[PDB]
A = this chain, B = another copy of it.
Amino acid sequence: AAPQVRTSAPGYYRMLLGDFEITALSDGTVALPVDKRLNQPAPKTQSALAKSFQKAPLETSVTGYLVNTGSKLVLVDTGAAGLFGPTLGRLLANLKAAGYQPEQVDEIYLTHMHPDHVGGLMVGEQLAFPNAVVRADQKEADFWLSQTNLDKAPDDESKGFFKGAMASLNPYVKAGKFKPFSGNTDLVPGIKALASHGHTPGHTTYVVESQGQKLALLGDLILVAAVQFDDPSVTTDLDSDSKAVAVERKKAFADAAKGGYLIAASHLPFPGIGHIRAEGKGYRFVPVNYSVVNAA
């Protein structure tokens, strides 16, 4: 026989979208006590997860999305680097395994500034993406980079969020490489920012379109697949505005269902890409069928 290997394959998933190349990049996974963070009784979460053959704590993917439009290379979210423990921070290595170098990234779009999305921006004291311009909504940057907000943060978890956002973005701000937008904004050709505020004050969805094929990168608009597709009204204590996140999630799901296009989200099971159909009181996520990509 042979010794066991016990390693996972490189965490990248390639998919074509019209003339664009999408690469989902895994940052790793982390076990989350979702039954304690969701705004509903723990037994109800347990029953939902059991319907999906799952149990809390739940191993949850953390994913960023690389878009090569053919003229620009854009990275949507960057993982956690070392901010959330040793099971995360795989995204840079998976970017390299996917055939790219960090120096090649032209722009980085942040759905929001929670540590598991901004941590990858820094390797120690060095910019992880030395040529990239970072973009996020002005509301997001104004909230998370505020010293006064950090000084008035209620608990250690929130303080750590502020500190991580500052440590990750401020070096780019200082280098002149942070370029905010406000609300719905055309970014590089083929990618648009769609305001989806409420998980954080400036949470933004990024819509990628090429040759009639559309993909909405929803960020953290959904967090627990086995709960929030069936019941989109369930929120978490990590959402800044629970009512707004429910409204925005329902809007995104309704639009994806009506349009029949792809969505992706950072914490859907990797690669986190699929279609949505409206069913009953909520929605059914349909993960994309495994497809091989070959050179053109």
**A contacts, CB < 8 Å to B:** 1-2, 4-14, 16, 21, 23, 26, 28-29, 51-54, 58-59, 61, 68-73, 87, 97-101, 104, 106, 260, 269-270, 275, 277, 286-287, 289-296
Q: Separation in Å of the A96 CB from the closest CB of chain B?
A: 11
The secondary-structure label for the interface of chain A is loop
A97 to B87, CA, bound (A): 22
Candidates B14, B29, B73; contact of A9 at CB < 8 Å: B14
User: Could you list 18 A-B pairs, sorted by A, with CB under 8 Å?
Assistant: A1-B72, A5-B98, A5-B100, A6-B16, A6-B293, A6-B295, A7-B14, A9-B10, A9-B13, A29-B290, A53-B260, A53-B275, A59-B289, A59-B290, A59-B292, A61-B290, A87-B292, A269-B290
Instruction: Determine which of B7, B106, B287 lies in contact with A99 in the assembled complex, contact meaning CB atoms within 8 Å.
Output: B7
Contact flag A99-B5 (CB < 8 Å), given A54-B289, A269-B289: yes
State whether A8 touches B295 (Cβ < 8 A).
no
Query: Bound complex: CA of A30 vs CA of B100, how far in Å?
Result: 28
Report the copy number of this chain in the oligomer. Answer: 2
Residues of B within 8 A of A287 (CB): 269, 287
Which of A8, A13, A292, A295 is the most central at the interface, judged by chain B CB atoms within 10 Å of its CB? A292
> B residues within 8 A CB of A11?
9
Contact A14 B10 (CB under 8 A): no
Across-interface contacts of A12 in B (CB, < 8 A): 9
B270 touches A290 (CB 8 A): yes
Residue in chain B with minimal CB distance to A296: B6
Interface centre among A6, A26, A53, A289 (most CB of B within 10 A): A289
Q: Are B290 and A4 in touch, CB under 8 angstroms?
A: no
Chain B residues near A2: list those with CB within 8 A.
Answer: 68, 73, 100-101, 104, 106
Whole-angstrom CA separation of A270 from B289 in the bound complex: 8
Q: What is the CA–CA distance of A135 and B14 in the complex, to the nearest angstrom?
A: 36
A294: chain B residues within 8 A (beta carbon): 6-8
Report the minimal beta-carbon distance from A291 to chain B, rounded to whole angstroms. 5
Known pairs A1-B69, A9-B13; list 11 more (Cβ under 8 Å).
A1-B68, A1-B73, A2-B100, A5-B14, A5-B100, A6-B16, A6-B295, A7-B294, A8-B294, A10-B10, A28-B292
- B58, B68, B270, B292: the one within 8 Å of A4 (CB): B68
